[PDB]
Amino acid sequence: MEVIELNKCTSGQSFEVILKPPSDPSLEEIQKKLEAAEERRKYQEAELLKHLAE
Amino acid sequence: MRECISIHVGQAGVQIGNACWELYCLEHGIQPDGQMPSDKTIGGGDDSFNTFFSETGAGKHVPRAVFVDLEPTVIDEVRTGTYRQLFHPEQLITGKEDAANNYARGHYTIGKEIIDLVLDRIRKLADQCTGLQGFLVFHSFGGGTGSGFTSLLMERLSVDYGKKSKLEFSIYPAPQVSTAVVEPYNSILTTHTTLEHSDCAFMVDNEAIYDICRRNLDIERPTYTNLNRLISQIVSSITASLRFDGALNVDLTEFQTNLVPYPRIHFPLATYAPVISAEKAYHEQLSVAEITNACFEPANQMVKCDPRHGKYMACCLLYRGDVVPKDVNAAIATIKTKRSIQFVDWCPTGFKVGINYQPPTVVPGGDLAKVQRAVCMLSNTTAIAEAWARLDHKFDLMYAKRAFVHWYVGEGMEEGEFSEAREDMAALEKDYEEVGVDS
Amino acid sequence: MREIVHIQAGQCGNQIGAKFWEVISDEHGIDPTGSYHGDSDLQLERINVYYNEATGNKYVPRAILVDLEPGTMDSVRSGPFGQIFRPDNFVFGQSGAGNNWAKGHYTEGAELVDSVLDVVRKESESCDCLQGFQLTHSLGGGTGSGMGTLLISKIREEYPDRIMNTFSVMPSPKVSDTVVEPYNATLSVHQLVENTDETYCIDNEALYDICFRTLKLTTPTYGDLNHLVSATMSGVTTCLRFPGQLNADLRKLAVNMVPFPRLHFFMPGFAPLTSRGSQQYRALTVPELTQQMFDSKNMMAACDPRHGRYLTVAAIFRGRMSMKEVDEQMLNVQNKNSSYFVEWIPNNVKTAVCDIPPRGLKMSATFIGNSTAIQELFKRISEQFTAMFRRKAFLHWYTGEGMDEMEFTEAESNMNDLVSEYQQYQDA
Amino acid sequence: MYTFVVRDENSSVYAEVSRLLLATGQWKRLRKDNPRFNLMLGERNRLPFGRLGHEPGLVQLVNYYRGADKLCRKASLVKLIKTSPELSESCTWFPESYVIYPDEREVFLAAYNRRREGNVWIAKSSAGEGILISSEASELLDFIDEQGQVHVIQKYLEKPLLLEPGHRKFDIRSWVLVDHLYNIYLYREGVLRTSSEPYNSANFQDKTCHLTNHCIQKEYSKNYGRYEEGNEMFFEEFNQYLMDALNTTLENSILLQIKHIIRSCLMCIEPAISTKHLHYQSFQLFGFDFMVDEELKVWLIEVNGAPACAQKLYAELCQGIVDVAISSVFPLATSIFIKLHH
Ligand SMILES: C=C1C[C@@H]2CC[C@@]34C[C@H]5O[C@H]6[C@@H](O3)[C@H]3O[C@H](CC[C@@H]3O[C@H]6[C@H]5O4)CC(=O)C[C@@H]3[C@@H](OC)[C@@H](C[C@H](O)CN)O[C@H]3C[C@H]3O[C@@H](CC[C@@H]1O2)C[C@@H](C)C3=C
Ligand SMILES: Nc1nc2c(ncn2[C@@H]2O[C@H](COP(=O)(O)OP(=O)(O)OP(=O)(O)O)[C@@H](O)[C@H]2O)c(=O)[nH]1
Ligand SMILES: Nc1ncnc2c1ncn2[C@@H]1O[C@H](COP(=O)(O)OP(=O)(O)CP(=O)(O)O)[C@@H](O)[C@H]1O
Ligand SMILES: Nc1nc2c(ncn2[C@@H]2O[C@H](COP(=O)(O)OP(=O)(O)O)[C@@H](O)[C@H]2O)c(=O)[nH]1
Ligand SMILES: [Ca+2]
Ligand SMILES: [Ca+2]
Ligand SMILES: [Ca+2]
Ligand SMILES: [Mg+2]
């Protein structure tokens, strides 16, 4: 039931009311993922072209 | 004054971004030309609004924003739109063909060819900043670009800006307006990859927005334009503290501090009131008590869930208009003894309150009526995990049959990433349950 | 802005191909001279998907007409919109294929295939961002079936990352009594299973029964059938050439409709079913459109949807109507017959709405279903195949062109496997 | 044509409800994992309430109230009555109870010392058997530590009302139906699960004159069905007994208190479980169990969230469930309930 940190200005105001107290991967690794995915694509397409060549 | 850069990814991001920056211009009295008459200091300054707008010598106020889409069709409308003079061409980035609702296509295949371009375009905005706070990133979960490219961008941002904060505005998929059966896949994949890179994410379920438009705006079949103007109001309520003079949530870091006790559980629930139809002949203006009480009604939430069967970790009340602290405190007193509001034991049962005397600005000709007072409640409740549960269940149904999976594997993604992402979501649900559930 | 390249091969392919182009040319306000006289600006917003431009504002169909004989392509030139086609895009031989898959795929067609790809290559170079190809053809003949699938294979080899879409007319003993058609169709299906992303199964069996039982045509003509084919092709391509959100390009469509790579054979549907030159007096309501488009008697594949389950469905409503009522009606259908929709693909029914209606109608509905009931179609073809092949009947017509019996066995095995795969997901 | 799903095969009550719906020809049963349903007869544990009300075009209803477990768990019910100001110590119809972990141990010990200076208690948990009656706290505490899960220590009613002839203990089961509007319907037909062996104040170990469970009376008793069939006496007979033996009536001496207790418990938790403005709707059938002392004072013993029914009463009650809890939401093409207005 206590109000704290009441701040006022021309635009408005703010405060806090308490009703009760308590009871990353590097750029290297990212490139290694993107290029590893691209290689799997290149491999899959290479197989298709090989199959179509047969 | 510390700068904020907004990044809009994919169709949902761009179109929502359009609505927001349109609303920002009205709120700050900025013209479509970029001119702002009330700005006495020409060609610079460090006012609160300067956090979102930079200035030129000719007195033009341009948004600190970048738009990115793998397809040109949507951003082309921005290039030719009413706010074409607002952005300089560098800020608007587009590709030739999109991610085709495929996370892997947007993340790996196509994403690899434009990521360096986007980052360089972002670096140019950063160089214009004297003290960058971080980024606000708008995107859908369901799109291939919104999901796949965004997660790639967030990973790169953490690398190039390891100290800056990053907030999300994410669109959760809804069948009533969805355009792909694989949106559950795309949602889980992007959430897994972005999770450690996002400091605070505000999810918006299209289902909730759709029904609000139908129920309260009397719109029979809501369009994206209908959805986005409503979404922009919520986004405006949330970013208002960064753009105006105040003492609550003054910088991006405050959002994490006030709303996010645990890093992974960084998904605050947004509730907004009142939503009134402009077509209604006259209207009884709702009091502080009535709009505050409506913040605990599931029908007004940006995500449909039941906060009664969860726990609160934090609660922020953002008022716009005719509101004084006295009436707010009295409204809370009535509500606390009326509704079921439980906080976690290691948290104080309290509310952080911010008031902005300026009433909500509405788009002239829109569907929202002008009100003398509105409020947006930001509450970090475990109840929002219901949305994770729903999403994960739809994932499991399809993935058990490996339906559509070949579309992702074909783009270079390994099948193992599916189960890895899913197990991450599985742990996420468990975290929510640990915090909000007992016997 | 993303271009599609259209190819029509053989007699059937060119006949339904021409009928398709005159219909969409009309819808986009394009006359036989290739000039735009349309009133709406919607007709032109995405007209580059199917058309090229030129000085004097001439819109030229991005279409390639192919055949091993000049006959049918002569008919295309003579009658409109015969002069909208780029003259250098007419690629034809003299020998013919004699309703023989082997001749189209291995001997006669092989000699003409290179000159076709040169034209395809020139078209692809004019495209700012090619998204894929669409082929019209029959499976029962020799050129469309044999040379058609040869083209598909050689096109995929040169454009492996593009979408391949086909309108494939399945043979029926009710419409054509050429005895080797089951051979030609089985050889073709083997090819389609491997080399297309999306195939619309346009079944002459279903087309005949619609004209006979529903349209009350005692002696239906190919003009009658192509009337149904044309309306269907217009309906299924509506989301590609008009401003829309759902299935706006070939790849997004395939991603929504194809849960497994081999299962990309769609059952098309349409309502209302009408006959050419016959003016319908009463327009249908939204409820009527919805019920009819899902009706077994409105399917172009001649399969009973009740005999299987829907994996995915795309619905397109055209004309000025209530989006709200459309949403309600599409919802009740699923909720009324939820058992027929697989539960392990949530929300697998998508709906699109276009304001611009087809010619002669204030509103219509087009159905695109990926149903396991399509197995009945391939099962029908397979029985007609084995009856002859178990005795090696008429096989000398093919072995004479250099083919071996083993190639027939493999084709038959693949189609039978396709049938069993549909069955396993019908019991999932 | 309405649709529903069954996710609890073991529920005899909703098995009958399922039969009636099909017999109408206006309902259709779907696969238990088909999301396009109107009605869900959900499971007893971990019912996925979070996935309800998210199917466009469908009005969805489920036969359970999320959060009603607060009333249907022995430990939960005790904590609820004490902390809830709507009940609190201003509750004179609930036996003195304490939650004990293998915590209100000190408070229970303090109460045990005062009673010693009628001091008979009973230990029980939510998880037949598993119960021990004793006059010594050490015996009860050893059992609670002997067992695994949490138990509830409650004052044992030493002076219960005894049926004559027989001199035997008994309890009352009341079935209560709460619909989507939170109307509270009391089934007019209740049942008395009686003990066969005469009540003995001395010997507590011979648990057969103390425990009136239907299973125990047909497995530890030799007088099963001698006094009444299946040890089940219904309201008509019990009313006649009260009139002949005590010159009073069931309505006046007992039923008024039962209706009061029922209304009190459910109104208390209403704001926490009501689905009035929810995206999905709830209803639920409850089983209230009462005790009556020699002074005709009614006591609440517990509340069952997944109750069964008496064999003779299945047809009537399950039909009433369809009429009031289901058809009220999904209409088709005197009442057996008493509406406890509020
Ligand atoms: C005659 C002719 C000559 C000409 C043949 C056109 C065509 C197109 C190409 O596909 C092939 C076919 O037609 C092939 O057709 C075959 C010859 C080679 C010719 O060979 C090829 C090519 O010739 C002949 C037929 O199959 C004609 C069918 C046959 O039913 C089985 C007959 C009953 C049968 O006689 C008694 N059991 O009714 C006929 C029913 C069909 O009539 C046609 C019109 C009549 C038909 O236009 C319309 C369709 C829409 C239809 C429903
Ligand atoms: N609220 C709202 N949601 C949108 C909007 N546009 C798209 N969505 C939602 O976003 C999801 C689809 O993702 P998109 O953003 O359209 O796809 P994308 O990011 O452009 O990526 P691509 O697949 O390459 O096109 C669907 O669930 C839509 O409901 C919008 O303008 N407003
Ligand atoms: N505090 C108490 N005083 C006197 N008798 C009591 C009592 N608590 C329980 N009983 C007796 O206990 C029996 C019921 O046990 P209890 O109901 O607590 O366990 P339970 O939940 O496994 C059975 P049900 O759910 O069917 O009522 C009653 O028949 C009654 O005779
Ligand atoms: N629907 C339809 N089917 C046709 C048409 N022309 C031929 N067919 C069918 O195609 C098969 C014959 O193949 P056809 O295309 O004429 O041989 P091709 O020229 O070697 O490809 C038969 O099953 C015919 O029924 C047509 O205009 N419309
Ligand atoms: Ca300034
Ligand atoms: Ca970080
Ligand atoms: Ca030759
Ligand atoms: Mg897009």
Ligand SMILES: [Mg+2]
């Ligand atoms: Mg019990």
